[PDB]
Amino acid sequence: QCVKLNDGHFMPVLGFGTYAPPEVPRSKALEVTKLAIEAGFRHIDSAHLYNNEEQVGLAIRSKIADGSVKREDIFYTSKLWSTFHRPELVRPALENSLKKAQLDYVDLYLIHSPMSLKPIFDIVDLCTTWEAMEKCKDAGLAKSIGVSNFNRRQLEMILNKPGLKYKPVCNQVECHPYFNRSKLLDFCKSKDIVLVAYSALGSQRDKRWVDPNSPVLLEDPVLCALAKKHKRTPALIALRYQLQRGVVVLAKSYNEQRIRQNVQVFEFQLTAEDMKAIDGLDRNLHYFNSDSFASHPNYPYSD
Ligand SMILES: NC(=O)c1ccc[n+]([C@@H]2O[C@H](COP(=O)([O-])OP(=O)(O)OC[C@H]3O[C@@H](n4cnc5c(N)ncnc54)[C@H](OP(=O)(O)O)[C@@H]3O)[C@@H](O)[C@H]2O)c1
Ligand SMILES: COc1ccc2cc([C@@H](C)C(=O)O)ccc2c1
C-alpha cells in the first residue's frame, strides 16, 4: 500500500530500516537490502550518518539491473546530517549522498535532526536550512522533502515561515507502543504531514544511547497476548498498530527470516479492542535517552 504525500508523490507505507552499528561489516547492508526488496519492501530508509549509502544504493541498482524492480518502483530516503545545517552545505551534502548511492535523485531527503552540530553544538536558523531543501526539490535532487526528530514547535516554525514554498511531507520520529506520539500524530494529520515511525520495534537497544535496563518492547505482555490471539508475532502486532493509526512504519532487520516475516503486516488486521489495548501501553518512553541529545539547546523532547 502507499500513501499520497502533500506534494503529490506517493510513499510506500512500510519501509526497510538499514542502520546497523559499525561492528556489522558494510557488505551486510548490500545483502539485506537486496533481501528486503525481494521480500516486497519498496521503501528503503538510509542516511549519510549510516555510512551505508554505497551499499544500499548498489542493492537498489542491483535489483533494477536484474529486472525485479524499476527505479520508479523504489522509494529511497536519505537524510542531511546535523553538521551540514548551514544552508550553503545542504545541496553539496545531498549531491554527495547521491554520488555514494550512484542514483540520480532521492525520493525523500530529510533534515535528520533539529539539533545542529559544528560543521560541540552549532546555532543555525532551520528556516534557512529548509529554504536550501526547497531548492533541492526544485532542482530535482529530491522528489520530496521532510524532517526528522522535530517536535510540534519546531515543525510549526517551518510551517509558519514567511514565503514557505513546500511543507515538509513527513516528520520521521521515534514511535512505538511505549511512546506512541498521539498528540504529535494528531497535529501532523491536521496539517497533512505523514508521521513516519522509527524504532517501531523498540530500537536496536544500542548502548551508545539506550539504557539496557529499559523494558524490551517485543517482550511486552500485551503485545505477546495479541500475537498469540492473531497467531502472528509481537513485531507484527507493533507494525500493524502503526499502519492502522495512519503512521508509515519502518522496520530494520538484518535477518533473512525476519525480513520476510515483516511484510506479513499486510496479511491481517487488529480490531478496535486490540488497538485500544496497544494504545494503553503508552508511557512516554523514548529509548534514545542520552546526554548527547538531552543537553542540546534544540533537544526535541524538551516539550
Ligand atoms: N531518523 C532518525 O533519527 C532515526 C533514528 C533511528 C532509526 N531510524 C531508521 O529507522 C530504522 C528502524 O529503527 P531501528 O534500527 O531502531 O530498529 P527497529 O525497526 O526498531 O528494530 C529493532 C530490532 O527489531 C529486530 N526485529 C526486526 N524484525 C523482527 C521480527 N519480525 N521479530 C523479532 N525481532 C525483529 C531487529 O533485529 P534483527 O536485525 O536481528 O532482525 C532490530 O535490530 C533504522 O534502521 C533507521 O533506518 C531513523
Ligand atoms: C531525539 O533526536 C534524535 C536525533 C538524531 C538521532 C539519530 C539517530 C541515528 C543513530 C539514526 O538515525 O539511527 C538515532 C536517534 C536520534 C534521535
Residue numbers in the entry: 6 to 124, 138 to 321
The authors write:
The enzyme forms an α8β8 barrel structure with a large and multi-cavity active site that exhibits flexibility at both the level of individual side chains as well as entire loop regions upon ligand binding. The active site contains a conserved catalytic tetrad consisting of H117-Y55-K84-D50 with Tyr-55 acting as a general acid and base, as well as the oxidised cofactor, NADP+, deep in the site.
We determined the structures of flurbiprofen, ibuprofen, and naproxen bound to the AKR1C3 protein at 2.0, 1.8, and 1.9 Å respectively. In each case, a racemic mixture of R- and S-enantiomer was soaked into preformed protein crystals. The naproxen structure is unique in having a disordered cryoprotectant ethylene glycol molecule occupy the SP3 pocket – this location in the other two structures contains conserved water molecules that overlay the ethylene glycol molecule closely. A detailed comparison of (R)- and (S)-naproxen AKR1C3 complexes shows subtle differences in the protein-ligand contacts in each system. The (S)-naproxen molecule displays 86 protein ligand contacts with 8 active site side chains and the NADP molecule, while (R)-naproxen makes fewer contacts at 78 but with 12 active site side chains and NADP. These intermolecular interactions translate to different percentages of the ligand surfaces in contact with the active site; (S)-naproxen shows a 384 Å2 complementary surface with the protein out of a theoretical 429 Å2, or 90% complementarity, while (R)-naproxen shows greater complementarity of 95% which might explain the subtle preference of AKR1C3 for the R-stereoisomer we observe in our crystallographic experiments.
